[PDB]
Every structure is written in structure tokens, then in C-alpha cells.
Design a protein around this ligand. Sequence first.
Ligand code: CLA
Ligand code: CLA
Ligand code: CLA
Ligand SMILES: CCCCCCCCCCCCCCCC(=O)OC[C@H](COP(=O)(O)OC[C@@H](O)CO)OC(=O)CCCCCCCCCCCCCCC
Ligand SMILES: CC1=C(/C=C/C(C)=C/C=C/C(C)=C/C=C/C=C(C)/C=C/C=C(C)/C=C/C2=C(C)CCCC2(C)C)C(C)(C)CCC1
Ligand SMILES: CC1=C(/C=C/C(C)=C/C=C/C(C)=C/C=C/C=C(C)/C=C/C=C(C)/C=C/C2=C(C)CCCC2(C)C)C(C)(C)CCC1
Ligand SMILES: CC1=C(/C=C/C(C)=C/C=C/C(C)=C/C=C/C=C(C)/C=C/C=C(C)/C=C/C2=C(C)CCCC2(C)C)C(C)(C)CCC1
Ligand SMILES: CCCCCCCCCCCCCCCCCC(=O)O
Ligand SMILES: [Fe+2]
Lengths: 341, 36, 505, 30, 30, 33, 33, 34, 37, 37, 82, 38, 65
Amino acid sequence: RGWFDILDDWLKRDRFVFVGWSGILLFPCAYLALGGWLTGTTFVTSWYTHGLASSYLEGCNFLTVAVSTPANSMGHSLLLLWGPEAQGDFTRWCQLGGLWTFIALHGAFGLIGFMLRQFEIARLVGVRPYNAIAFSAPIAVFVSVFLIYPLGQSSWFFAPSFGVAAIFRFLLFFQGFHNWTLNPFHMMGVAGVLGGALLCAIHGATVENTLFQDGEGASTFRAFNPTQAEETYSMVTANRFWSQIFGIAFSNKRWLHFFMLFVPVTGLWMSAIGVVGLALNLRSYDFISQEIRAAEDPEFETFYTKNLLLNEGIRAWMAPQDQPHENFVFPEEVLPRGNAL
Amino acid sequence: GGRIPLWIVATVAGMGVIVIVGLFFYGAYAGLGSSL
Amino acid sequence: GLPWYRVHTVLINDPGRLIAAHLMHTALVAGWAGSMALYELATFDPSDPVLNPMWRQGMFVLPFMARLGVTGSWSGWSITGETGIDPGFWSFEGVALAHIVLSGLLFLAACWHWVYWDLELFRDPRTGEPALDLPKMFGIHLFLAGLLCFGFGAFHLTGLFGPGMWVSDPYGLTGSVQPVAPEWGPDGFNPYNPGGVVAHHIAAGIVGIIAGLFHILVRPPQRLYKALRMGNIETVLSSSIAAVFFAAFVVAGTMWYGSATTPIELFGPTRYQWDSSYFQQEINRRVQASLASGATLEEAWSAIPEKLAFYDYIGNNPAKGGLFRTGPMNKGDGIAQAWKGHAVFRNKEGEELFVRRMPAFFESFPVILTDKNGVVKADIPFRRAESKYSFEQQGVTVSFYGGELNGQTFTDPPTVKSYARKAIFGEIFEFDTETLNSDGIFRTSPRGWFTFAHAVFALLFFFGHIWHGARTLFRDVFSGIDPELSPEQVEWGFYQKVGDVTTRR
Amino acid sequence: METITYVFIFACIIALFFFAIFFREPPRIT
Amino acid sequence: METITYVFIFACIIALFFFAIFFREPPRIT
Amino acid sequence: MEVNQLGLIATALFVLVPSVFLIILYVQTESQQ
Amino acid sequence: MEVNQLGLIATALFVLVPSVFLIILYVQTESQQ
Amino acid sequence: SYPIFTVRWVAVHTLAVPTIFFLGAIAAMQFIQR
Amino acid sequence: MEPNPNRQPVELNRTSLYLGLLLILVLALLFSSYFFN
Amino acid sequence: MEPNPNRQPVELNRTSLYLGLLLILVLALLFSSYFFN
Amino acid sequence: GTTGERPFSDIITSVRYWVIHSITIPALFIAGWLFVSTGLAYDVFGTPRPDSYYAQEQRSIPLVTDRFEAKQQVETFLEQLK
Amino acid sequence: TITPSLKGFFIGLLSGAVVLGLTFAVLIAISQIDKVQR
Amino acid sequence: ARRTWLGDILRPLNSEYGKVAPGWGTTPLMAVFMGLFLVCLLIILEIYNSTLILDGVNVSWKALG
Ligand code: CLA
Ligand code: CLA
Ligand code: CLA
Ligand SMILES: CCCCCCCCCCCCCCCC(=O)OC[C@H](COP(=O)(O)OC[C@@H](O)CO)OC(=O)CCCCCCCCCCCCCCC
Ligand SMILES: CC1=C(/C=C/C(C)=C/C=C/C(C)=C/C=C/C=C(C)/C=C/C=C(C)/C=C/C2=C(C)CCCC2(C)C)C(C)(C)CCC1
Ligand SMILES: CC1=C(/C=C/C(C)=C/C=C/C(C)=C/C=C/C=C(C)/C=C/C=C(C)/C=C/C2=C(C)CCCC2(C)C)C(C)(C)CCC1
Ligand SMILES: CC1=C(/C=C/C(C)=C/C=C/C(C)=C/C=C/C=C(C)/C=C/C=C(C)/C=C/C2=C(C)CCCC2(C)C)C(C)(C)CCC1
Ligand SMILES: CCCCCCCCCCCCCCCCCC(=O)O
Ligand SMILES: [Fe+2]
């Protein structure tokens, strides 16, 4: 046999952890992304890029550690270790935020590798590729949020920093500056995620409560055999129940499970489209008719205008520390504030 | 093979994990990151 | 029957009707181009390229005609404002008419191919079954594409036989269509060097010719034929979709960042020019040079072109719009009428103060004035009871140099504050808000809208690539998995190699 | 006009509920 | 908008002519 | 309220065009043998 | 020209509603056995 | 009869060894004073 | 539920489709000017 | 003129009609506010 | 079915496994502990010590402001600490 | 003229070549040593 | 199937459906060309991104003069 065929044999051996040709891309990249996150969160600072402490070594906890984005002055530089910024100096690279681009790039290629793994394994075992197809939603979210959005903004600095509290700050920044909650694409994403959770719960519970009695045990799990040919629960009884409770019910199992694929995947894709818009500040920020009315009529008020006031507060109070490169100095007298607070 | 019982292994390992996590919370209240 | 989402699969093994459908799509696209051009001509106002250029008026296709050398109208005007220039047939109107006629012809050809689908050319001589030799088709079409690319580069862009392309100075003040020579050195790969475009199309076209000859003459290796399922046209769909979404991302990027092929006189400035104060820096350099030469402040600022000043204004920043704020930029701040002049703020002590400019991120922004060292000297307070930096307290005045208000000074605090509120936007202009019933809310430019559309479409086409590539590679299980699937093939340890029954243990 | 549009769409959705519940294609066991 | 509407209706009518002539149901003798 | 005038026709067509597409397909399915 | 704003939707619906009625009937006739 | 070193061994240890190292480091950090 | 015996199939041939579309489009072309006023 | 053998009948069942109408009407309800702005 | 690797339970309940790991695990843990307690982590990763965030009278953050001079800017900040 | 960034680009290209080449050489060697028995 | 004059002319161009070269054929050459193309794309990207900076190549609008 040729060396290519021998290598294919070895890569596709049946072992505890499947490797595959996709493994050559997936495993080094996924390992480097995860290891970079752990290394940065344990030992690396954000002092020179954000003015922040961001590691266990500095005293942060699991909620506050992060691998923070590079400084805004770096633009969209790849920040390669051998690049002109760090110039091969590992310590300076870490201090300049090279770990953020390191993680983002090795992670993107790791996602590519994992999807290729889905395809490869499906082909080898003879199943259809719908798991790989569904994984396109996480990939679309990751690309839109961590690459396209910063690429449309001034620099990597405004991408999410890899951390719990940093992600929370990302949420609040999007509310304050983009009015992201008002965006119908985020709304469709929310519908997809919450509806997916609803479907997950309702289907699990319906199956578990329409099981057939296939054993004498009061714990019903042992009464299923993976090689059995018969359905383990009564579709007829479940359909009757939901028809009489909610008015409509599934009657086709194949449609049911495809719908479970369709809902969350579509929702995430819609959210990604919205974020592509926000990359250009192309927001659903205002309703022009309401703004005209409110400008002319000081007694007109809605929850929309109230939320706009909240956004103005967020921007004014968070910008000076969240965007240190701007050198904002907002005198106390200019800060928006309500009475007494 | 099975010289050391698996229940003993599991109990000891769990105790070790608990000790590590507890020490980390102690650190939350001491030294760096304690606000003091 | 077929589900609604599969109706067009009837074409998969019907090359003639596939050609008919593709002809219909091409006809629709050409007709759209013609209709859009005619609508833009019916709406476009060519009378002020300085302060009312095409990119202020929501013009989407007009810049693309202008980029490749179409600049005149049959009505007698040109987008550069020149007078008495005759474009011949290839005016904007002529281009629109040509695309419309092309649409009609493609419609008729589509009808013919739909009716006469059953042509002998589409049948395999050996078996009589419909068959397309996709590898040789690729070679042929690559050869043709290379010829067209090389001709475009060597004749149109160079001006040897053709008009050339749009080129301008670094500040977008004197753009025009010019012949461009190729740049073969390293600077040819600089996106901002137009000669690189000419060189690329020449060299890439030659490579296309050569590679097309290769793909015409040399058959695919059996290994690759089987691996890529080259007998199945859906593999071509998958790979072509991949190439298309790659291209869409590239063009979105070049539109957003600027390049030789996205001039600011055609698509508007970029957000990064505002970020970096590009135009403000040029304006200050010119003013300082004039002052050093001896001019007065009024003369120095009056020497500044209104076009440059207009670029230095955030209302032209494409990152200031909204998804559902529809229409031209004019529909927002209004139709720009004139530069009011440069506003110089001073406090009671006579020290010059500078208004902090609004960053693109902010829908609203406070008014803060600092000295040359960045020390805050005045502002417009929110809470008044403890104000220390009010314009009233600090005796802030504003004097204008150049523009409409040249030589005028204002001391009334309301007027001074209003001018500062405008100064956060950069240079100050007088706008006509009545003609369009403008609502005073910023909108993005064609640069922004193009970038948004093509980024979104590129992402969606990534999903398309995944879907059709999966269909290609898993065609044999599209309707379900083998009812006889051996449990041993999925049992662990049964085969040494996953899914290879020849490796049974 | 906008209020009419919103209410019209809502009323259409409710009618759709009615038909989807009481005029569904009946499930039939094989 | 009004010019677009008029021209759109006219173009639809012309397309209708095309289909009514070249894609008619063919007369067939009994 | 000073709303976008074209919103009415935009919404009407957004609803009607896809809905009529679906209705056509459904009725012609029902009429099949 | 200062035309009646509702003219656009009036004309659009006048054309679309009867046309779609006819199209539905025709397609469901064609699909019959 | 089992081999000792396998792909699974490599994966397990690539995860395990740095994990213990890092846990030691974080434990030590708990005793740092400002 | 016994079916209703009064049901009848309905038809519209292609010539009728063309005639109806012509009527509708020409009426629209005629009345659109008055709708816009 | 020999008929084209690649033709296939198309279908949309009643449940699909209801699901599609729901999708369309809900999308309209969602986006109408932004269309009116 | 199993793929032929030795069972994990069999491995972790074996005397030899723990003979090896009662040495290896403590050694790695101590290596990390010392990595921190000797201060080598600060040097390797460039992380400020508690007394190295500011100069004695400084309150401004040492933000990097130039892309191609960032390395030198950081070095200048470090020198200014002294 | 070989700019410092061009030297760095060469360093990165060669480093990637070494990484990939070592990976593939090791994989080929191991696959040759430990073959599947048909 | 209908024969036409143009169809007869084009016949040879659609007569080799399914024909392949044995085994790997030109695959190694294809692989080399793919590697060169990838390296070229990396170079162009780094130039646009300012990670690779070359004498006489100023990546800015100021390249217009
Ligand atoms: C499949 C595995 C894989 C993949 C896809 C990547 C991908 C990447 N890495 Mg990661 N990396 C990996 C494994 C991998 N890495 C491993 C195993 C390690 C540990 C050793 C690292 C350590 C690492 C570091 C430390 C850094 C990266 C960086 C990068 C990025 C830039 C890479 C680059 O420019 O290479 C370019 C190289 C090539 C494209 C190889 C071309 C090979 C051809 C054949 C060479 C042809 C010409 C050549 C001269 C041959 C000469 C032959 C003859 C003359 C002798 C990119 C996202 C950088 C980063 O993240 O920046 C933020 C970075 O700083 N990597
Ligand atoms: C690449 C596409 C493209 C781009 C970038 C532009 C860009 C532009 N056009 Mg043009 N246009 C295009 C295509 C395009 N056009 C086409 C195809 C037509 C024919 C219909 C037109 C017709 C047209 C007219 C008639 C006019 C413009 C105008 C304009 C300008 C303003 C655009 C605006 O307000 O957008 C607003 C954009 C939006 C509000 C976004 C809509 C988002 C949709 C509704 C989301 C849909 C979501 C979906 C339903 C969810 C699916 C659910 C899921 C479960 C599947 C701008 C320069 C205007 C101008 O100034 O001209 C001088 C103008 O008057 N254009
Ligand atoms: C070159 C582009 C291209 C081409 C030629 C095809 C061709 C095909 N696709 Mg693929 N597809 C593409 C891009 C493309 N697709 C992309 C980008 C996506 C991701 C969005 C998909 C996702 C996709 C899926 C999920 C499926 C297909 C299927 C199919 C087949 C049947 C399509 C059909 O009957 O639709 C009929 C469609 C309609 C009757 C109505 C569609 C209405 C849309 C949703 C809204 C209106 C769009 C508007 C009118 C056009 C604007 C387009 C412009 C903006 C670009 C056909 C072979 C199907 C298949 O494989 O069947 C076996 C299938 O299930 N495609
Ligand atoms: C049969 C299971 C059905 C219950 C469903 C399980 C609920 C979900 C549990 C998920 C976590 C599993 C907990 C183990 C559930 C369990 O049953 O444990 C038992 C399982 C097998 O244990 P033994 O080897 O003792 O097996 C005895 C056998 O003779 C038969 O049981 O142990 C493991 O798999 C743990 C090894 C950790 C392996 C770490 C490897 C790290 C490799 C990193 C690379 C990863 C691949 C990356 C892919 C890209
Ligand atoms: C970056 C970089 C790199 C790499 C690195 C790496 C690869 C690393 C890794 C690392 C690692 C790999 C680490 C790890 C760590 C880990 C940890 C730190 C863990 C922790 C844990 C925990 C804490 C847990 C806890 C818990 C709980 C709480 C409950 C349940 C149980 C448990 C135990 C889970 C290199 C060299 C290339 C160079 C360049 C840069
Ligand atoms: C097993 C297992 C595990 C683990 C566990 C653990 C870790 C546990 C522990 C436990 C424990 C560890 C327990 C203990 C107990 C104890 C007790 C219960 C005691 C008692 C005591 C007493 C009662 C006392 C009393 C007193 C008093 C009161 C006074 C003084 C004197 C005296 C002290 C005596 C896991 C989960 C991993 C897995 C599964 C299995
Ligand atoms: C036949 C004929 C003729 C005529 C022609 C014509 C007259 C044509 C027309 C054509 C046309 C006139 C065309 C048009 C087209 C259009 C289109 C194709 C459109 C499209 C649209 C779309 C697709 C849209 C979409 C959308 C919307 C709606 C919203 C927003 C979003 C989007 C953009 C997606 C002549 C005499 C020349 C010659 C002979 C034959
Ligand atoms: C596609 C595979 C990519 C693999 C890339 C591996 C990267 C390994 C880099 C390690 C050496 C970095 C060079 C350090 C010296 C460079 C200094 C300089 O001249 O700028
Ligand atoms: Fe299920």
C-alpha cells in the first residue's frame, strides 16, 4: 500500500479518542486555544492594554479573570509572536495582548477542525451529516461576534474579552451603545434559544411520562434495550394529551426532531446577522416617530424613552474607564443624573 | 488490577478536590483580591 | 410530491432547462441593473459635486458606473461638474438601456432553451444519458474568464483601448477617470495603488489562460475524481458557493477599509478617516503653512476647500447610521448648502479652547472644551447647582474664520453653546432641511450599506456551502441510512479501522 | 393606519389559531 | 411612486400578451 | 405619529406575497387525485 | 406631484387580490387528475 | 495484555500534567500579600 | 362524519386566467390615476 | 413535442400551510414596527 | 465493545499506578507552587507585582498608544517604575 | 531590501514548515511501524 | 435528442464524461501550486494588515500621492 493509504489507516483506527485527518487540525488548535485561555487567566495581566488586573496571580477570581483584548492602538494587527509589534519577545507579546489573537485564531481553526470531525465521523459510520450542519450556528455566532464585529469597529479592543465578567461587560456595552435589545435579529435569536430550551424540556418530559411499562422496576430506566425495535413511549398517548391540553400536538416523530434542530439553529443564525449589522454601528437604536413626538411634546413618555435615558447613563458613566485610549475627562457637572442619585 | 478499592480512590480524590476549592475560597478572603 | 423547498431540483439532470433557468436569473439581474440605474437617474441631482455628491444622495449603482469610466449624461452634465462634455453612447442612460435590452434578449433565449431542452449535445455519445463533462467545462470557462480578465487589464484599465479607471489624490479632492499603467514591483500588492489592479488583472488573466488550457487538456486524477464526486454537478455548486462567499468577504472588507477600487469621491469617506482625524490633520497642516507664509487667520482658513472641510464632518462617517433609518444621507442632517467656517472658541482670558469631538460609538455626546494641554476649561453642565465650567461663568465666545460666517464673533451664551453643540460633529455646515423634510437623524452611506449587505450575504453563503457540500458527499444517505446497517460497523473494537469491514478483528 | 395594521395582523393570527386547532388534519393511526 | 406604478402595470400587460400568444392552450381539432 | 409612509405597503406585501404563495401550493395539493 | 398617499396601496391590492384569486383557481385546476 | 503508552495516554497526560502544575501555582498564589 | 354529497370541483382554464388577468390589469391601469388623484 | 420526463408534482400539506402562515404573520408582526419607524 | 486500551478503573486501582503517581503528582504540584513562590511567573509573563503597578507618586495607567513602538513604550514604563 | 518584518515573516513561514513537517513525518513513521492487519 | 448545427460543432467538447487519469496523476503538482497560492495569500494579507512592512510599500491613502 502507498504511504497515504497507510496513514489513512492509522488515522482512522478505532481507538478511545478518534483522531482522523480532521484531528491534525483540530487537536493542536483546540489544545492551544484552551491552554492559552488557562495560561492567560492564571498568569497574564491586562495592565498595559486596558489598565485592568485579569489573572489569578494578580488576585482575580474565576468570575473576574480574563484574556483581554489588545490595546486599541494595535488596530486589527494579527499580533504574531514574530510580528513587528512583539518582535519575538514572548513577555512583551503577552503584555501587548498577543494571547487574545492567539486564542481567537487557534480557536477559529479548532472550530473548523471540529466541524470537519463531524463530517468525517458521519461519513465513516454511515449516518447523515445533520450534526455537522447544526454546528454551523455556533460557528456563525463565533465568527460574527469575535471576528466580524471587531473588524468593523476600530480594533480588536472592542471584541469580547475571554472571561466571565468581561462577557458581562460586553452585554452591557451592547445595551448602552447599540440598544441591542431593541434589535429584531437579537429578538429572533432570543426566541430561538428560549424556544429550544422549551422544546428540550417538553420533549424530554413527554417521553418520560408516556413510557410503556417494559419491566417490573419502579425505576424505569432498566426497561430499555438499545437494540430493541419497538418504540419505548406511546406517540399516540402523547399526541392525545397535547391535543387536549394545548390544542395542537406533534403527530410525526421525524418532523418533531427536525423542528428541534431547526429552532435553535435558526435563532442563532439570526442573532449573528444582527451582530454583523452592529459591526458597522447599523443599529436598531431609535423609533423616529416616537423621537419626533417626544421632542415636541414633553408629556409623552414610553418605556422606549425610559430605556434611552438608561442608555445615556450607561454611556456617560462607563466610557472614561472602558475606553482609556480616548482620554475622556467628563467633569462631574456634565454627567447625566436624576434627582438625588 | 484492583488492589486499592475504587470507592476509596473516589473518596480520597473527592476530599482532595474539596480541600483545593476550600483553600481557594480562603484566598478569596485573604491576601490579594480580598479588598483589604 | 416534492416539498416546496426542493422544487428546483427537477433541473439537476436536465442541462438544457438548467441553462434556461440560469438565463432567466441572468436576465432578471441585468434588468435590475437597468431599472436601478434609471431610478437613480430620475432622482439624482448633479448640480453640486462639492457638497451634494452622489454618496450623499443614496446612489448605489452610479458609483460603479463612474468607477470604470462612465461619467457623463445625455442631458449634458458630468459627475465631475465639468461643462460641455459629450460622452457618446456610453452615458449613464446608454448603459441602462444596454442592460435592459440585454435582459430582453436573455429572456427570449431562456424561452428557447426551456422549450428545446432535449438537445443531442447534452447526451453522452456512449450511453444516451444526459451528461455534462464538468472538468472540461471548467477548463473551457476558465480559459474564457482568463481571456476576459487579461483584456480588461491590458486594454480597458490601461487606456490602450478603453477609458481607464477612477483615480484621485489622497484627500479625494480631484478624482477623475484616468488611464493607469501596471505596477509590477512590490507596491503592486498595496491595495491603495491603482497600478496594482492593472498588473493583477494582466498577470492573473494570463495565469487563467494557461491553467484553463491545462484543465482543458489534462483529465482529473482518478483519486480526485472519486474524492470530489466530479460526476455530480452539486459538487460544483458547493465549491462555487465557497469561492463566492470568499469573494463577498473580500469586497466587504475593501469597501469598509478603503482601497484603490473604493474611492471616497464615489462611496464617501471611511469611518477610519474620522477615527484618525485624517482630514482634520490635513486641514491644520495647510492652515499652518499659510500662517507661516504670512496670511492672516481669516485668509488661512478661507484658503481651505469646502470639499475638504466637508470630509471633516461626522455626518459623512458611515458608522453613524441606523438599520431602519432609510434613504440618502440628505434625508438626515439635510442637503448641505455651505461651510459656515472654522469655529475658534475662546474663554474670557483669550485662551483658545477646543471642543472634544464625538466618537462614532456615541449616539449622543456631552460638550466639553479643553485647552491645548487637554485641561478642561468649559462645558455645558447637566446639573447647574454646582456648575464651575459653564460658558456663562467662563465667558466663552466663538469666532469664525472662512466660510459664510468669516470674521464674525458671537458672545451670547445661547448662540455660543449652539455652535459648540455643532462643533462636536467637526466642521460646521449650513443645511437645507425643508426640501426633503429631513428629520435630523444621521444615516449611513453607500459604503456602509454595501458593506452590510455583502457581509450578511457572505455569512449566509457559508451556510449554503456547508449544506450543498454535505449533500454532495452524503448523497447516498440523503433519504436515510441503510436499513441493514450492521451493528458491528458501529460497535467499538470490532473493526481495527472505523467503517472498514476488511479490518475485522 | 399603523394601529389598524398591528391589530389586523393580531386578529389574523388568532383566526389562524382557531383553524389550526379545530380544523386541523386529524391524526389517524395506521 | 406613481410613475413606477403606471409603468409596472404596463409592463405586466405586455408580459401577459407574450404568454397569451406564445404559451396559449393550443387549439386541437376533434 | 409621523411614521414612514411606505411602512403600510411594505407590511401588506410582506404578509400577502408569501401567504398567497403558500395558499396556492396548498389548494393545488388538495385538488390532486 | 402631491398625490393621494393611499393610492399606491389601493392600486397594489386592487391588482394583487383578484390576480391571486385567479392564479389559485388556475393552478388547482391544472393539478387535478 | 495491554500497551502502556497510547494515543489515549497522550491525551490524558496533555490535560492532566499542566492541570496539576497550574493547581499548585494557584494554591501558592493564595498566600501572596500585597 | 359522512361526507357532504353536494360538493363539486371548481375549474378555471388557462384562457380564463389570461382573460381575467387582462381585465384586472386594465382596470388597474384605468383607475390608478383616479386613486392617486 | 415529447414531454419532459424530469417533471415532478409539488405538495404542501395543511399543517405546512398553517406553520408557514404562522411564520409569516409573526414575522410581519415583529418587523412592522420597524417598517413604520 | 471496547477499543483495547486498558480500563481506567483497572489502572487507577492498581498498585503500580500509585507507586508512580504518588511521586509524579506531588512533584508537578510543587513545581507550580515554586514557579509562583520564587517569582519566576512575574518575569516570564511580564505581570506587575503588587508594588509595580504605579510609580510612587503616579496615578496614570501605562497604556500602550503606538502600534509599532509598543514594545519600547512598555520598556520605558518599566524603567519609569524604577 | 530585507526589512525586519520580512525577516520575521520568513521566521514564521519556516517555523510553520518545521511544525507541519515534523507532525507529518512522525505520523507517517508511526503509521508505517503500526499497520492494520488485513 | 435534437441535433443542431451548433450542437454538432460543440459535440467534441462534451464527449469525455467520466474520463480520468490513473491513480494520483497530477495531484502532487496541484499540491505544490496550492501551497504557493496559500503563501501568496498570506503575504498579501499581512501587507494589507501591516504585519509585513516592505520598503516602498506605504499601505495608506497617501499611496495616491
Ligand atoms: C495545524 C496546526 C496549527 C495551525 C493551523 C496553526 C495556526 C496558526 N498559529 Mg499556531 N502552533 C501550532 C499549530 C498550529 N498553528 C503548534 C503545534 C504550536 C506549538 C509549536 C504553535 C505555536 C504558535 C505560536 C507561538 C504562534 C502561532 C500562531 C499561529 C497563526 C499564524 C501561523 C502562521 O503565520 O504560519 C505561517 C506558516 C505557514 C503557512 C507554513 C507554510 C509551510 C510551507 C510549506 C513553507 C514553504 C516555504 C518554506 C520556506 C519551506 C522551505 C523549504 C526548504 C527551503 C527548506 C495561525 C492562526 C501565531 C499567532 O497565534 O499569532 C497571534 C503565533 O504567534 N502558533
Ligand atoms: C446589495 C444590495 C443593495 C444595497 C447595499 C443598496 C443600497 C441602497 N439603496 Mg437600493 N435596492 C436594492 C439593493 C441594494 N440597495 C434592490 C435589490 C432594490 C430593488 C427592490 C433596491 C431599491 C432601492 C430604492 C427604490 C431605493 C434604494 C435606496 C438605497 C439606499 C438606502 C438603502 C436603505 O435605506 O436600506 C434600508 C434597509 C433596510 C431597512 C434593511 C431591510 C432588512 C430586511 C427587511 C430584513 C429581512 C429579514 C427576514 C424577513 C427574516 C427571515 C426570517 C428567517 C426565519 C428566515 C442605499 C444606497 C434608496 C435611495 O436613497 O436611493 C436613491 C431608494 O430610494 N434602493
Ligand atoms: C448559487 C446559489 C445557490 C444555488 C444555485 C442553490 C440551488 C439549490 N439549493 Mg441551495 N442554498 C444557497 C445557495 C444556492 N442554492 C444558500 C446561500 C443557502 C443558505 C441560505 C442555501 C440553502 C439551501 C437549503 C437549506 C436547501 C437548498 C436547496 C437547493 C435546491 C433547491 C432550491 C429550491 O427549490 O428552492 C425553492 C425556494 C423557494 C420556492 C422560495 C425561496 C424563498 C426565499 C427563502 C426568500 C426569497 C428570496 C428572493 C426571492 C431571492 C433573493 C436572492 C438574492 C438576495 C441573492 C437547489 C439545487 C434545497 C435542496 O437541497 O433540495 C434537495 C434545500 O433544502 N439550499
Ligand atoms: C454509558 C454512558 C451513558 C450515560 C451518558 C453519560 C452522561 C454524560 C457524561 C459525559 C462525561 C463522561 C463521564 C464518564 C462516564 C463514565 O461512564 O465513566 C467511565 C468511563 C470508562 O471507564 P473504564 O475505562 O473504567 O471503563 C470500564 C469499561 O471496561 C466498561 O465500562 O471512564 C471514562 O470514560 C472517563 C475517562 C475520562 C477520559 C478523559 C479523556 C480526555 C481526552 C481528551 C480528548 C477528548 C476527545 C475530544 C473530542 C474532540
Ligand atoms: C499559550 C501558549 C502555549 C501553550 C500553552 C498551553 C498548551 C497551556 C496549557 C495549560 C493547561 C492545560 C492548564 C490547565 C489548568 C487547569 C486548571 C487550572 C484546572 C482547574 C480546575 C478546577 C479548579 C476544577 C474544579 C472543580 C470543581 C469546582 C467542582 C467539580 C470538580 C472540579 C475539580 C472540576 C505555548 C506553549 C504554545 C507557547 C505560546 C503560548
Ligand atoms: C464517594 C464518592 C465521591 C466522594 C465522596 C466524598 C468525598 C465523601 C466524603 C464524605 C465524608 C468525608 C464524610 C464524613 C463524615 C463524618 C461524619 C458523619 C462525622 C460525624 C462526627 C460527629 C457526629 C462528631 C460529633 C462530636 C461532637 C458533636 C462534639 C465533639 C465530639 C465529636 C467530634 C465526636 C464522589 C462524589 C467523588 C464520586 C461518587 C463516590
Ligand atoms: C423582452 C424584451 C425586451 C424588454 C425587456 C424588459 C423591458 C425588461 C425589463 C426587466 C426588468 C425591469 C427587470 C427588473 C428586475 C427586478 C428585480 C429582479 C428585482 C429584484 C428585487 C429583489 C430581489 C429585492 C429583494 C429585497 C427586498 C425586496 C427588500 C430588501 C431586501 C432585498 C434587497 C433582499 C426588449 C424590448 C428590451 C427586447 C426584446 C425582448
Ligand atoms: C500552520 C502551522 C503554523 C505553525 C506556526 C508555529 C509557530 C512557532 C513559532 C515559534 C518561533 C517564533 C519565532 C520567534 C523569533 C521571531 C523574532 C522575529 O524575528 O520577529
Ligand atoms: Fe426524542
